[PDB]
């Protein structure tokens, strides 16, 4: 057992579009790069290539070659204290204002 | 389809932590996510299935497909081709931070 400064993990746990932690983590199944579900869907609305490594996700339908990464998202929710509380509370608050 | 719900449409970043808090992590903690279900030790030379994003050992996965089932040992789905297996450097990058 060790104690780790989280500033050491934040690279492995953060979306390069959102500047923050992964929420609903999603993965390009070609290069194994990962982004928030919403971040990459909006990105792929205008590019068929990875934001980081710059590979072609598909010639035509980029969304074809990306999958949810629950394995990765669970690692985030576990390492980052109360991130899951915070994110779930955010969603309830929203639907309490928009039914 | 990847349709974004009203929430997802307007969601904001989840701000990261620059504060420098420290988390405590045992070899048991997070073990459900870090153990190759073949060898039940730490993932060494990780591999991932492209159809389902499941991680295994490079040295370990060759023998489970070798015993005749040609499906994903986790979600029991037919593993097509050989290009369905890619080594995962961004994932081993993560193991190297957590020796125990
Ligand atoms: C891990 C297995 C595998 C596959 C593959 C993919 C899908 C079904 C398969 N059934 C046998 C193998 C294999 N393809 C490859 C490959 O990269 O060529 C591998 C592989 C990866 C790393 C090291 C050694 C090998 Cl052989
Ligand atoms: Zn993001
Ligand atoms: Zn990439
Ligand atoms: Zn293994
Ligand atoms: Zn699988």
Q: Helix axis angle, A70-79 relative to A83-97, nearest 10°?
A: 110
The distance in angstroms from the start CA to the end CA of chain B is: 39
Please tell me whether residue B66 adopts helix, strand or coil conformation: coil
- DSSP H helices, B1-100, are 6-10, 31-34, 58-65, 89-95
- The CA distances from residue A96 to A68, A87, A90, A91, B6, in Å, are 27, 14, 10, 9, 12
Ligand 3 centroid–CA A59 distance in Å is 15
Is residue B87 within 8 Å of residue B46, measured between CB atoms?
yes
Judge whether A12 and A34 are in contact, CB under 8 Å. no
Give the E-state strand segments of B1-100 in sequence order. 22-25, 46-49, 55-57, 85-87
Nearest to B96 by CA among A73, A4, A20: A4
Main-chain phi, psi angles of A33, to 5 degrees: -100, 155
- Please state how this structure was obtained: NMR
Strands A25-28 and A2-5: unpaired
Q: Rounded to an integer, what is the distance from CA B21 to the centroid of its chain?
A: 25
Beta bridge partners of A26: A35, A68
If you search the block for the tokens 């903690």, which residue do you land on? B29
- Counting ligands in written order, the one closest to the CA of B15 is 2
Determine whether the shortest distance from the Cβ of B61 to ligand 1 is under 6 A: yes
Let me know the angle formed at the C-alpha of A13 by A10 and A16, rounded to the nearest 5 degrees. Answer: 90
For residues B88 and B48, the answer to whether their CB atoms sit within 8 Å is yes
| DSSP E strand stretches across A2-58 | 2-5, 25-28, 33-36
For residues B20 and A61, give the distance between their C-alpha atoms in angstroms, rounded to a whole number. Answer: 41
CA angle B32, A22, B79 (to 5 degrees): 55
Residues of chain B with Cβ-Cβ distance to A13 below 8 Å are 16
Distance B58 CA to ligand 4 centre (A): 7
B66 Cα nearest atom in ligand 1: 11
Encoded tokens for B28:
């048991």
Domain ranges of chain B: 27-100
Number of A:B CB contacts under 8 A? Answer: 111
Q: What are phi and psi of B74, to 5 degrees?
A: -105, -55
């Amino acid at each position: 057992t060790t104690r780790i400064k989280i500033t050491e993990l934040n690279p492995h746990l953060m979306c390069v579009l959102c500047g923050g932690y992964f929420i609903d983590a999603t993965t390009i199944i070609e290069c194994l790069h990962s982004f928030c579900k919403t971040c990459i869907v909006r990105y792929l609305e205008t590019s068929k290539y990875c934001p980081i490594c710059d590979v072609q996700v598909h010639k035509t339908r980029p969304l074809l070659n990306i999958r949810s990464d629950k394995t990765l998202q669970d690692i985030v929710y576990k390492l980052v204290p109360g991130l899951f509380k915070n994110e779930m509370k955010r969603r309830r608050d929203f639907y309490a204002a928009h039914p | 389809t990847w349709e974004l719900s009203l929430y997802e449409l307007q969601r904001t970043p989840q701000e990261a932590i620059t504060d420098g808090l420290e988390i405590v992590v045992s070899p048991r903690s997070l073990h459900s996510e870090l153990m190759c279900p073949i060898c039940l030790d730490m993932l060494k030379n990780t591999m991932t299935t492209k159809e389902c994003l499941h991680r295994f050992c490079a040295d370990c996965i060759i023998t489970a497909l070798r015993s005749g089932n040609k499906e994903c040992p986790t979600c029991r789905k037919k593993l097509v081709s050989k290009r369905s297996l890619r080594p995962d450097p961004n994932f081993d990058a993560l193991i190297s931070k957590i020796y125990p």
